[PDB]
């Protein structure tokens, strides 16, 4: 399937993934396409904060899902 | 090694026939309270021939032996007076990363040339007479003294966030959404004025074909063109005594060592100007911590300081006038965490969270492991 992510700079990035693909694989694809380290990625999907070690289907992610890339919180 | 080559360079420099001190002695009396005024009154009138004689400094109404210590104390006081930001001659590059640089606003004075020539003479006198200042400039300053080309990476030493933004512009493409163009806004005494990097530059937006020229102009204006006259006067004053053929055998680090000596972090000041949360001054994890900091090498102390506070550079007056993210924030030691976890650091508040360990050896091991990824000096 295909998913879309909106980064900080307003650029929309398309990723070719599968429903069974893990979060780690998607983050690796994002790093390959853009160079963003997975540890620095804070993605929001309909208010859900993604976590490593899980899969897209764990977050009820479907076809043409749209995510945002918010930034880390340190206070 | 690096040190042996530096010592060879120092010996060769001080062995030059054009940097030999004369046998005659020159007296120099300055009152302790009014050090800046008397120093500027005397130094700004000495001849170049006079400044090459032996320097003998005697404070007023303070008579004693070991004139070397007196001269060292005088140079310390003068260096902490002239380079003090409150005097509107120099300024910190950023409030949270203390780095001295020539203040662009210093041009407001009717005649800054005399003062900056005096500063140049002071620096040349310190280098000439084997006496050390104790100020810490930014690397671009030293690269300018030796007349080296300045590039984008040099902004890393001045301001980290500015360099990150410039590198972002260099790497990623720029659209027309950003309203960036060849002009810089500077707020001088309330009123904000616009400076054009290139003629008719305020009406030229930066496309993907101009951003390289934009970065070049921004770097040059931020590092050089904003302080042309003042630094020209300062370098004239400095080269009055030290010929430029002598300074140009060092680099941006050997010159720093020659000026300020081997940099060290004081521990007595650190202990006297720190505060604790949930920790008392008699708590074991405090006395062990201070013993460890007492018997440590300067590089590791600098690494710990950068790991905790955020930067390895200290204010001009030690830890007393230490700034945090929003304002003054002294070095804080806190009891937060479990025994197994390593010490943590909140940099924007200068906080070091040290869990309640049970022995000094374990504290030493945890603290040495936790600071490895941090590189200081």
């Amino acid at each position: 399937m295909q998913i879309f992510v909106k980064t900080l700079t307003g650029k929309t990035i398309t990723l070719e993934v599968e429903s069974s693909d893990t979060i780690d694989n998607v983050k690796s694809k994002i790093q390959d396409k853009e160079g963003i380290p997975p540890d620095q990625q804070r993605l929001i999907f309909a208010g859900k904060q993604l976590e490593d070690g899980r899969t897209l289907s764990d977050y009820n992610i479907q076809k043409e899902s749209t995510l945002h890339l918010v930034l880390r919180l340190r206070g | 090694s690096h040190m042996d080559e530096y010592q060879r360079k120092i010996a060769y420099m001080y062995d030059r026939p054009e940097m030999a001190v004369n046998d005659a002695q020159l007296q120099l009396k300055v009152s302790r309270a009014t050090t800046f005024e008397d120093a500027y009154d005397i130094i700004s009138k000495l001849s170049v021939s006079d400044m090459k004689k032996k320097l003998l400094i005697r404070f007023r109404n303070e008579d004693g032996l070991d004139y070397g210590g007196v001269s060292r104390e005088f140079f310390y006081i003068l260096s902490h007076a002239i380079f003090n930001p409150g005097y509107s001659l120099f300024e910190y590059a950023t409030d949270d990363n203390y780095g001295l640089q020539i203040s662009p606003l210093s041009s407001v004075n009717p005649d800054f040339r005399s003062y900056f020539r005096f500063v140049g003479r002071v620096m040349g006198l310190a280098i000439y007479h084997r006496r050390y200042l104790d100020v810490q400039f930014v690397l671009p300053f030293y690269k300018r003294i030796l007349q080296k080309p300045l590039c984008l990476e040099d902004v890393k030493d001045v301001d980290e966030v500015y360099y990150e933004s410039l590198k972002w512009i260099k790497n990623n493409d720029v659209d027309e959404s950003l309203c960036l163009n060849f002009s810089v806004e500077e707020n001088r005494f309330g009123e904000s004025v616009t400076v054009d990097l290139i003629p008719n530059g305020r009406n030229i937006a930066v496309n993907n074909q101009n951003k390289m020229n934009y970065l070049k102009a921004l770097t040059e204006h931020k590092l050089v063109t904003s302080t042309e006259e003042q630094f020209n006067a300062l370098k004239g004053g400095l080269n009055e005594l030290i010929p430029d053929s002598v300074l140009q055998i060092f680099n941006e680090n050997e010159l720093d060592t020659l000026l300020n000596g081997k940099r060290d972090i004081d521990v007595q000041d650190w202990k006297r100007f720190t505060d604790y949360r949930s920790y008392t001054e008699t708590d074991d994890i405090v006395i062990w911590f201070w013993e460890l900091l007492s018997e440590w090498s300067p590089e590791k102390k600098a690494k710990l300081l950068q790991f905790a506070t955020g930067t390895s550079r200290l204010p001009l007056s030690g830890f007393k006038d230490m700034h945090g993210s929003d304002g003054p924030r002294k070095f804080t030691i806190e009891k937060v965490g479990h025994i197994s976890q390593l010490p943590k650091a909140h940099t924007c508040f200068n906080r070091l969270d040290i869990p309640p360990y049970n022995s000094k050896e374990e504290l030493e091991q945890k603290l040495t492991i936790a600071i490895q990824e941090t590189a200081g000096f």
Binding site: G75 | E164, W168, D326, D353
Partner: protein, 147 residues
């Protein structure tokens, strides 16, 4: 670049606001902005309104703005003075970020406090141990101060 960008941001906010947050200059000074954040309905701070002061440095957009809370908020990652230095404002700042992104990030922070950034260690410990007590205290503070 430090005034045209600010005018562009103000124009963008005045056309399609996020429908929750608002921002505007105080009097006539484009480098000092007041902002209003509505309390998120999915967080204990619901039903409240918070005020922020934003100072734009002259190096904008290369240097991030300084935002500070005004109304008190019982939050692990917000101190008494209201200082915020999260990555969108101190570490991960790029010229592409506008002021609406900062407001959205703060409004998201008001619902998802950090677990391991104890700016207030007592409150962070309460959050890690007794979530119900933390939420009750946050609601009490919002009732006392936000209104």
């Amino acid at each position: 670049m430090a005034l045209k960008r600010i005018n562009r941001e103000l124009a963008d906010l005045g056309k399609d606001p996020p429908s929750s947050s608002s921002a505007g200059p105080v009097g006539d000074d484009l480098f000092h902005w007041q902002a209003t954040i509505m309390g998120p309905a999915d967080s204990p701070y619901a039903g409240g309104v918070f005020f922020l002061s934003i100072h734009f440095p002259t190096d904008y957009p290369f240097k991030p703005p300084k935002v500070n809370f005004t109304t008190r908020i019982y939050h692990p990652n917000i101190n008494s003075n209201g200082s915020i230095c999260l990555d969108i404002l101190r570490d991960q700042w790029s010229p592409a970020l506008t002021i609406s992104k900062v407001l959205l990030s703060i409004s998201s922070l008001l619902t998802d406090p950090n677990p391991d950034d104890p700016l207030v260690p007592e409150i962070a410990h309460v959050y890690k141990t007794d979530r119900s007590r933390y939420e009750l205290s946050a609601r009490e503070w919002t009732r006392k101060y936000a209104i």
